[PDB]
Design a protein around this nucleic acid. Structure first.
Ligand SMILES: [Zn+2]
Lengths: 87, 118, 216, 54, 205, 97
RNA sequence: CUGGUGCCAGCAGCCGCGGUAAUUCCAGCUCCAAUAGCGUAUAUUAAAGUUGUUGCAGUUAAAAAGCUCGUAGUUGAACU
RNA sequence: GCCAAGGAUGUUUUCAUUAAUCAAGAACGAAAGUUAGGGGAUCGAAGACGAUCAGAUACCGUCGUAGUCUUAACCAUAAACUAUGCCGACUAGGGAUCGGGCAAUGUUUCUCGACUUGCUCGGCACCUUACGAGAAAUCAAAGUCUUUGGGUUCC
RNA sequence: UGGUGGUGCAUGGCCGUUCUUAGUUGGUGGAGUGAUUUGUCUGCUUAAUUGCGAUAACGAACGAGACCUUAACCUGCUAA
RNA sequence: AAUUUUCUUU
């Protein structure tokens, strides 16, 4: 949020889980970040280039983290033939 | 009852893991070695520790024991862990048979192994 | 002279993390209060009560003192500490340590047009603990804190200059009252306000950023 | 008997006389003879030898 | 994304079939139905081998991107996966926790076993729910070698395998070590691995 | 508080059930509330098999048995120790030991 | 804090203090709150989310008619 | 055996809003209790004795009237309980059970039945868990309530 | 100043019981809003919370044990 | 089988 001056005044901007679009509280100790690096020809994944996902504790307890991570990677193009939108 | 105290158990285990090669068969010799290395305030405590040490050696010689380590079978475990047979999964051409398994294998990307099952 | 025993503690001691808001952003658990002591200095506390609970025994009654403390100076940082101990002195000290470990960020908004610094809660928040419900309502500039003495003191440490309060249940239970108020305040950074709809770029975390400056 | 060096005294006050008992554990070497309690037993560390020695 | 270098490689899938990694026991848990093919008779579920490999390479990817391999921990309280985890930590820089988990490993900074890893790889979530619980307490991602009869609670990446057969457990652990070594460590896909998959196998004292 | 979810008897989808008589004290206990046991005892003790065989006819005939259904009340069952008071956690099990 | 009585006198809105060491009884000293004003008795209002449309509660604290039909009353699918 | 009626299921059958909850008013309403007729085996209020006890007036044994059965008239309450009103929508995983229906180049016994598997509708329930609720015991409703409003009675 | 005068229901010190037995408590963690609980236990064994073992507990402290005294044979090791 | 009672406080 911005005041009348225009700058951003707040303690911090919480990050939102990519699986449910809900913010992660400071005490969400079951909310983890998954980091996966891209790969080139003949393997040998180049360090420094990676894609990140955040999964909230609510999803982790509900048990939907596996399918949510499958959807995220399939949409990004990192996995093939694992998750399908038509069940 | 002659139940050994926890101090005797811990002290006996420590000397066993520290001076296993130095140990001998005779209990009196084992008493002598403990008096030589391990300084114990009481002769009675020294004899009790030596007696437990002798019984531990008797049972260890008769069979392996878990919670003591002295440059020994705790290394022979990895020596025998390096063992490798001639790939038990290699077979030649016939692994198993299942109609649904074959259908999935043929569908996805692969062809191998015959059919039979039931 | 305190020596850290955690990876986050070592990073904080070195100075890799520039603010505790980063640790709050990645929701990294805090096990040592020295991290909070380093990040938030000049943090004053306030003791609310010392409840002498008892435990009947075969011979007599075993009594221990239970202390409640709220801590936080003036800026969106409050912490609740509850400690039971044989002596009041150690009970108080443990309460300070737990309050420091339990410091939480508080979101402060505006009642109307955003002219100046935040003074009130952005949205109506609520917190229930043991049938005691505390509801915080945004208030216009003025009228200060309309709350119970303990609740007003608690909100005076989070930097909320103006706030309406509503209480329901057995408010005489101080522990449940302060727990519900703390839950309501911590809920402020839990509501998805429309201004937060923007897709923030995902970060790294201090552990991943300094995985190479942390080795021995 | 050798590690609980203690003292007891009566202090007079406006109310009834109070009794003060102060007991200090002298360090383990303070036995006037020895250092080790008969419950603590230490074991020395030997030196490993070469199992071949050419 | 996924290049053509991740080819069919019929040899490994034949190893999977020989190791019997495609059999579930009896029961399904909804959260593990997308990984199975058409159900075999006599109440045995067949897992999708292609999906299993895709999850395995994804697990290898998430095991990578860790600068310190010691921050990756592998836990298997089952005796079948004891030496498999030991060989996994012997080949890659991971740390092996086999036997008793000693609850308080992830919390309770006082205890001497306070390790604080960055990622957890587990064999049986049912038998090792304590480790997953501790990881969920202390903000640690968890990947599991789950079967069709597994509870996918606090599990991010689950590889559908037998999870009960010694051959399957050893084979999947060997494959995971091979994939992570190929990804970053030293190994090349065009060349075979001197380390034999049969090494990871256990049981029969 | 409800000590038992089923209120101590198997009454689901019913409004009334017939009451049986306890064997020992002859108390009226409902059919779904009476503790039922099946005494299946040989007509003679196992220590008299040799004596019966040496004093029997019919070239090794089969020795009959007796089948008695015993329906105890709560108090009588507890006194007879066929059913015992268990802990709160152990109350939620129904499989015989 | 100092003196007098000792489950007595009594104090006391409730908890509650008093049986010879009474920070709660009566005498002195001082302090605290309002101020030319203060207390007490009664009626009423807020607190009372203990009248609850907003906004109560009904398994165990007070509270689901033994059950069903049924007219006033209340509420009433979508579609122009 | 006869008669009337009922739920669920199947249905490319029929009508078309005819519906939900109710004051007032009515039907049924365990057991015990009442008025007349029949019948009264067993048990058994009241009672009679006989043991226990300091006193037992009760618990124990035997006998024993009303009653326990039934018809024609009465009343109208029980911890009448799921201590949880009725209708409607949504919400997590699994396995048993009852009734119906669908499917099997399934099994079996001289066209059907029995058994096995999967799916589905409507019930009786059960295990684990808590996104959620409660003061907690606990609850798939007692959840979808300080983020408080689907409708309607009783209290 | 003195009081073997009272008050052991004002006290200190000492002693006796609970207790001829095996019990009791921190720190960090887990559970519960909370009083509290786990740790301190299914089982087996012991004089013993004695020890094996499982194990949301891990690492510890007191007690027990350990410890000290007392009664039994002889070494011509330095003697009467 | 059989087992009734523990005044008001400190
Ligand atoms: Zn009976």
């Amino acid at each position: 949020m911005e005041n009348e001056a225009g700058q951003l005044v707040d303690l911090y901007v919480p990050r939102k889980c990519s699986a449910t679009n809900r913010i992660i509280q400071a005490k969400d100790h079951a909310s983890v970040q998954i980091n996966v690096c891209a790969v080139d020809a003949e393997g040998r994944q180049i360090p420094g280039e990676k894609t990140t996902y955040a999964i909230s504790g609510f999803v982790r307890s509900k048990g939907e983290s596996d399918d949510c991570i499958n959807r995220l990677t399939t949409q990004d193009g990192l996995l093939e033939g694992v998750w399908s939108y038509q069940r | 009852g002659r139940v050994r105290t926890k101090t005797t158990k811990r002290a006996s285990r420590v000397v066993i893991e520290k001076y296993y090669p130095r140990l001998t068969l005779d209990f009196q010799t084992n008493k002598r070695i403990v008096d030589e290395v391990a300084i114990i305030a009481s002769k009675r405590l020294r004899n009790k520790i030596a007696g437990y040490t002798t019984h531990l050696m008797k049972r260890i010689q008769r069979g392996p024991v878990r919670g003591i380590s002295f440059k020994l079978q705790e290394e022979e475990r990895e020596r025998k862990d390096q063992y490798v047979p001639e790939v038990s999964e290699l077979e030649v051409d016939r692994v198993n048979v299942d109609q649904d398994t074959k259908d999935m294998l043929k569908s996805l990307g692969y062809d191998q192994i015959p059919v039979r099952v039931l | 002279e305190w020596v850290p025993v955690t990876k986050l503690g070592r990073l904080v001691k070195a100075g890799k993390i520039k603010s505790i808001e980063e640790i709050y952003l990645y929701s990294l658990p805090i096990k040592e209060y020295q991290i909070v002591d380093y990040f938030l200095p000049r943090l004053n506390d306030e003791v609310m009560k010392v409840v002498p609970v008892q435990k009947q025994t075969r011979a007599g009654q075993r009594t221990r003192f239970k202390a409640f403390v709220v801590i936080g100076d003036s800026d969106g940082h409050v912490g609740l500490g509850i400690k039971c101990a044989k002596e009041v002195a150690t009970a108080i000290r443990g309460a300070i340590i737990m309050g420091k470990l339990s410091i939480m960020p508080i979101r402060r908004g505006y009642w109307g047009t955003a002219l100046g610094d935040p003074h009130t809660v952005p949205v109506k928040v609520s917190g229930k603990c043991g049938s005691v419900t505390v509801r915080l309502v945004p208030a216009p500039r003025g009228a200060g804190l309309v709350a119970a003495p303990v609740t007003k003191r608690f909100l005076q440490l989070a930097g909320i200059e103006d706030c309406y309060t509503q209480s329901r249940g057995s408010t005489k239970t101080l522990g449940n009252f302060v727990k519900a108020a703390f839950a309501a305040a911590s809920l402020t950074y839990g509501i998805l306000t429309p201004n937060l709809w923007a897709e923030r770029p995902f970060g790294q975390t201090p552990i991943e950023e300094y995985a190479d400056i942390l080795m021995q | 008997v050798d590690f609980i060096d203690s003292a007891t005294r009566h202090v007079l006050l406006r109310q009834g006389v109070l009794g003060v008992k102060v007991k200090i554990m002298l360090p383990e070497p303070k036995t006037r003879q020895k250092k080790s309690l008969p419950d603590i037993v230490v074991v020395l560390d030997p030196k490993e030898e070469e199992p071949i020695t050419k | 994304g996924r290049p053509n270098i991740l080819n069919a490689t019929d040899e490994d899938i034949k190893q999977l079939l020989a190791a019997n990694c495609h059999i579930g026991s009896k029961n399904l848990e909804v959260r593990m139905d997308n990984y199975v093919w058409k159900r075999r008779s006599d109440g045995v579920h067949i897992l999708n081998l292609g999906k299993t490999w895709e999850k395995l390479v994804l697990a290898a990817r998430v095991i990578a991107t860790i600068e310190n391999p010691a921050d990756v921990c592998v836990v298997s309280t089952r005796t079948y996966g004891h030496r498999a985890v030991l060989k996994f930590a012997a080949h890659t820089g991971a740390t092996a926790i086999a036997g008793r988990f000693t609850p308080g490993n992830f919390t309770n900074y006082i205890t001497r076993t306070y390790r604080e890893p960055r990622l957890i790889v587990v064999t049986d979530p049912r038998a090792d729910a304590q480790a997953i619980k501790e990881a969920s307490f202390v903000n640690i991602p968890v990947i599991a070698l789950c079967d069709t009869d597994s509870i996918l609670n606090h599990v991010d990446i689950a590889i559908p395998t037998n999870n009960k057969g010694r051959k399957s457990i050893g084979l999947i652990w060997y494959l995971l070590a091979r994939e992570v070594l190929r990804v970053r460590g030293t190994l090349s896909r065009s060349a075979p691995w001197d380390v034999m998959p049969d090494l990871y196998f256990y049981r029969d004292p | 508080t409800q000590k038992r979810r089923n209120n101590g008897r198997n009454k689901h989808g019913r409004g009334h059930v017939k009451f049986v008589r306890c064997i020992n004290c002859s108390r009226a206990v409902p059919k779904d509330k009476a503790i039922k046991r099946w005494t299946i005892r040989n007509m003679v003790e196992t220590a008299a098999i040799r004596d019966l065989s040496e004093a029997s006819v019919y070239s090794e005939y089969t020795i009959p048995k007796l089948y008695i259904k015993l329906q105890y009340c709560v108090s009588c069952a507890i006194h007879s120790r066929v059913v015992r008071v268990r802990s709160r956690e152990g109350r939620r099990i129904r499989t015989p030991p």
